[PDB]
Amino acid sequence: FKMKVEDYFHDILRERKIHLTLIDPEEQTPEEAVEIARAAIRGGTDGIMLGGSTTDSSELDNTARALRENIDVPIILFPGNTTGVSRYADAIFFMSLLNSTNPYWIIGAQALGAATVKKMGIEALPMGYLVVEPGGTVGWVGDTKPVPRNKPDIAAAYAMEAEFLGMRLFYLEAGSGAPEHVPEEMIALVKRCTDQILIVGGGIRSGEDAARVAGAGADVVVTGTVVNVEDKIREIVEGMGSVL
Amino acid sequence: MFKMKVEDYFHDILRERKIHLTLIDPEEQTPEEAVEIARAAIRGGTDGIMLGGSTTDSSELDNTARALRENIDVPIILFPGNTTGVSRYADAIFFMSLLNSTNPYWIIGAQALGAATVKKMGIEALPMGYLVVEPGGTVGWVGDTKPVPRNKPDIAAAYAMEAEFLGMRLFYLEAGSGAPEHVPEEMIALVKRCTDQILIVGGGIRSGEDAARVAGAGADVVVTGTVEDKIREIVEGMGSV
Amino acid sequence: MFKMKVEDYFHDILRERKIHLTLIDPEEQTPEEAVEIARAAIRGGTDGIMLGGSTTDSSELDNTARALRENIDVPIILFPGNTTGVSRYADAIFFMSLLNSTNPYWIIGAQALGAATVKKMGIEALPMGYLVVEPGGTVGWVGDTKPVPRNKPDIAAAYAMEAEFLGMRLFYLEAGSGAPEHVPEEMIALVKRCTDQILIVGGGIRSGEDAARVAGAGADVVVTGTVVEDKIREIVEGMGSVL
Amino acid sequence: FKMKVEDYFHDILRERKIHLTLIDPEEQTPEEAVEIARAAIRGGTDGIMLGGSTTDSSELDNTARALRENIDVPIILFPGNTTGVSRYADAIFFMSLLNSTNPYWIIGAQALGAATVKKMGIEALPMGYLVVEPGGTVGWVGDTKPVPRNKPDIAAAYAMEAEFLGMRLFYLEAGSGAPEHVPEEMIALVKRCTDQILIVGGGIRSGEDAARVAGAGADVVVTGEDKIREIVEGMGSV
Amino acid sequence: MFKMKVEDYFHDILRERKIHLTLIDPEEQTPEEAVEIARAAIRGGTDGIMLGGSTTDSSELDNTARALRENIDVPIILFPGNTTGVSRYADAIFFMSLLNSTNPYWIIGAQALGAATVKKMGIEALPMGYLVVEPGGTVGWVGDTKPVPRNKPDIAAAYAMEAEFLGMRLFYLEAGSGAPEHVPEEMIALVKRCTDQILIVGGGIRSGEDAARVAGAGADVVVTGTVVVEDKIREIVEGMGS
Amino acid sequence: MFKMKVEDYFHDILRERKIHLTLIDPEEQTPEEAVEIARAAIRGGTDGIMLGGSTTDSSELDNTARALRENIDVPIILFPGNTTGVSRYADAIFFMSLLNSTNPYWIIGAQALGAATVKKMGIEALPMGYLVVEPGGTVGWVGDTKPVPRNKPDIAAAYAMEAEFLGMRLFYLEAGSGAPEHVPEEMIALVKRCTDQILIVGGGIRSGEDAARVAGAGADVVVTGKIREIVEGMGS
């Protein structure tokens, strides 16, 4: 990918919503990760997010290079810790876990990795990351107070705060594997209060899931690959397009 | 009062010279004495009035912000010590995260509580990374910080680069009001080359030669309290370099 | 004194009956709307207006406090969700520690930062231990609490005894504004047996029967919001039924 | 000691100031502690504080044991953890470590021990406990941010807060073994801002120390043989 | 030695079968009522008495520990809830870190404050990682924990491996006294698959069915309380045998 | 490459003499360079290479780790400044807990996240208690520590005994890379009197006389970032 990811997002958003496929480099081998990314490409995905866990970094470079040499959509780093920086990716979500109670996850980890992000000249997309009930594993490991599903005003406050600090992307995270995706009323309130790129993920499995999320205001929909894959992504992209 | 965006105002000045701001704590005097300091400091050549610095009564902030808005014409910038530091009468607010606090409240929690009020008042929000440097003053104690050691400039550079990556366009090296010595020139200089943000430096700046080294080191903005036309030599000092 | 101390006012009422207070959040309506809420609650029998909540502008607090005090003769008590919660125009302030927060700022730090303003303004400070009970509402989340489990009354009692030992004369069991169910009767009663302080219960008290159960279990003060006069009258009569 | 320790304290302060001798039950045997106790009483100390660090409570109980039926000055628990409560003392400084960053030392340890204090019927004196630099071992173990010596305003703010929360005693602690006692202007300022009993302790060695600390506002002086003389005598500067 | 080390005693039993331990809170009864409970539990087949589980004064602890030691021949193991929980009358102490507390005091600070005491007393110290599982009980609340979600066995296995790599030879999955449901079988089995530590499971184990499921899933040691005695313990012990 | 468990190798050395480890920050040079610093280190008499102390990128390690391993025959030991410090090309890892951090992430959290990887890689894990002494350096700042004060050796000895009781067989007194002065001799000695762990001391060890006094006070292992003089100093 030559183009800037952030410019590429704005290009897509003039006409439709963005889908991103999340891959954990630990869950498979680089070659297996390529066949997953390729199946998602055939399904209609717009990019690969790489990371999600806290784990060894050498598998990341291996997975990222195998991706960079075999696909033509951006590879975006979604770091679960400072280990999550690799050269073969096209951008990084440079994120702050806003509702952690631990300074390490809010500010400290990203301070440790900042020079390395600069050294590699990787495009850094400034992002507020907000864990919503139930929160999954990231909500537990990252010491969060998950935002309750019936308190959308709390989510809107953090999104406005993130916008005021300069973050141009905002991510409502229910947690990978959550039984229910982030509520529409919360997605819609956040979208109303901010002019950021709004990313929603966690528990989006069906096309009807993706349509509700997209219809509520999500600019970007993130899903994993648990199911068949090409088919899952295609249905998700269909629901995403089913909205106005 | 101030019509233009304080941030474009900043860039206009920076095309020729460096910026000086006067910090005024609303509690150390009545509103009308603060207009004294404000106008006197404007005569000294300051480019704006920073209001706040401590945790204060908010109705006092409103009265000093009003008194200033009715009488001076340099921008009035809120430098909030807590959510108590938002007032309708100011031109802008340093919307800041205390980056090296160990308490989530000072890093991110306080600002989430105030965000809706900032949006409601529609006050211009300047996104700022705020970094406390040894000794750190009262703000370093109350804000539960680990003040950056003065002989660890690489640490300051890492946080400056992180703030810029998070989208913060201002960065504030804070030695603390009343610090015996200002922020090291080596730190200011290393931060400046790592980031393309507006570098603000404050704390322990008294003399005109304090000004000269801070500004010469790389500061875009110099902040000083009061001790009265002790401002032109800081300005003087800043001048040149 | 022309106006008595709010803490004395409380003890006078507690000589014959239990106290009801009406919580008004200044950010949920306009000052004049707030006045009509208060006047209705006073017609319904409320003994005071508590003013505050998480998410609060100091400008709106002052405007609401000023409007209330022009128009009513019962006390106006600050129930601060942050340091922005202090206003010249109130009669008293619940000077409270959020006992079961995991964040020192809500336990002690916020109160240190405003102690000087409270002393400058000379507003009556009522020393209170504030304890968030499951589910805990928005204050429980913003204040970084570990809400006391509804089935662990011994925990609430330990905090009540400790707050008394530290010299706090009032103790507040907070289920959170809008909780589906008020603090359990068993917990209210056990706290009441373990301490001699004024016991305030709030959160999820909507009906006269809610108020009867909470008052009957031992609350000295019942606190309720205004989501629906009338509602207040039924609550106040519910509390009386227990005498 | 039949009377309430707090009443006792107020009687003393109608004429003079108060001295308390701190004994750590881990530094000596129970009968060795009674020896130090008597010497300081002969020396004019007003009471024995019993605690200072986290130690086995059987150590504490037995040191409180001998002490009770040998002396007639009060025994006051100065707990460093929940281990610090014994049926033997006349009173306990029921304290919150105000400038800890850890909730356990602000509020959590006292909640765990409250039911026990209430069962033993011990008189509990509500105290705000504030650590001043350098702060010593307690400042380090209690995860504190010690109040800088050149920031008396910070200490005054916590004193006002403690009073507002209903704490009737306030302890300015430099840390056992501190090179310098708490700064006079800090003591002066906090005494100006509160009507509580002001206890100061830590690094008060000579009669000059106890004089200067008492002259600055301190109502109670805490020190760790008959060296109490110049302390108590020094506290003669009224 | 006349008396085995408790850790060697555990390994001796484990060559043939699983270990049952009876948890007794000293604050819940008088010392001689505790003797009645403990002797019943021994008749039921328990292998030892754990003593503690609350934060309570050290004087009730010593009295209970003394009375137990006069009357029983199985080890008394301290299961401390704070530094108050150390007593010279026990045979050993679970020297534990609360791995998933967010408060350093419960991870490491409290154990630092009591270590000198443990050394001066003679107490054998069994090194243990203590991991609170949803719902967690009173200990999960007091100890500032983030209880491991029942559907997150991978998290529990990561802390088990970490404790093993740090030198802890015992690992305790704690659902909390009075938990409606015991620690999930899936979590137990994954933890057993990943570590060679002595694996202890407690909380909400009330029937022989519970115990057979917990033991069958891989627990080396089953802990149960006294709420209904000789019968419950026998039922639990026979379940474990199955 | 190694073979032989690093822990046994340490014990074999300590039957005769004290151990020296050479600390290499892989971020402050290139893999081919790091080899030269290492080869020069061993001809100075050092017993192994500690790889990390940072505060780093992890492609730099895996490549310095390989470069060190295929050139050298002393143990390569990871000294992780974060989870970023796990590389399969090393012989062992100081699997450590930052005992006097106020942050649970540095006490226990970070190590839980990397434990599965350490198991997968079969890297020898040495259980270690890591205790920052004032001034504490960069690790003591980043790791949110309350550094042990130099005049409070009882504090360090309390944590030494606690870590022994928890099963950590190595205890590391860290004054910080670049510290002006090394851990107080009274502190090293009191720690040695209180546990039976391998006692490691690092930070602020410059001269042969530096390495003579820390090893003299009780240290089993001496770490330094020259080495010839360090090693002869350690005898004593």
Swiss-Prot record, chain B:
Binding site for sn-glycerol 1-phosphate: 172-178, 203-204, 225-226
Family, similarity comment: Belongs to the GGGP/HepGP synthase family. Group II subfamily.
GO molecular function annotation: magnesium ion binding; phosphoglycerol geranylgeranyltransferase activity
Lineage start: Archaea, Methanobacteriati, Methanobacteriota, Methanomada group, Methanobacteria
GO BP annotation list: glycerophospholipid biosynthetic process
Designated name of the protein: Geranylgeranylglyceryl phosphate synthase
Cross-referenced Gene3D superfamilies: FMN-linked oxidoreductases
Cellular localisation: Cytoplasm
GO-annotated cellular components: cytoplasm
SUBUNIT field: Homotetramer. Homohexamer.
Known role: Prenyltransferase that catalyzes the transfer of the geranylgeranyl moiety of geranylgeranyl diphosphate (GGPP) to the C3 hydroxyl of sn-glycerol-1-phosphate (G1P). This reaction is the first ether-bond-formation step in the biosynthesis of archaeal membrane lipids.
Keywords, alphabetical: Cytoplasm, Lipid biosynthesis, Lipid metabolism, Magnesium, Metal-binding, Phospholipid biosynthesis, Phospholipid metabolism, Transferase
Enzyme Commission number(s): 2.5.1.41
CDD domains: PcrB_like
Catalytic activity, reaction form: sn-glycerol 1-phosphate + (2E,6E,10E)-geranylgeranyl diphosphate = sn-3-O-(geranylgeranyl)glycerol 1-phosphate + diphosphate
Swiss-Prot/TrEMBL cofactor(s): Mg(2+)
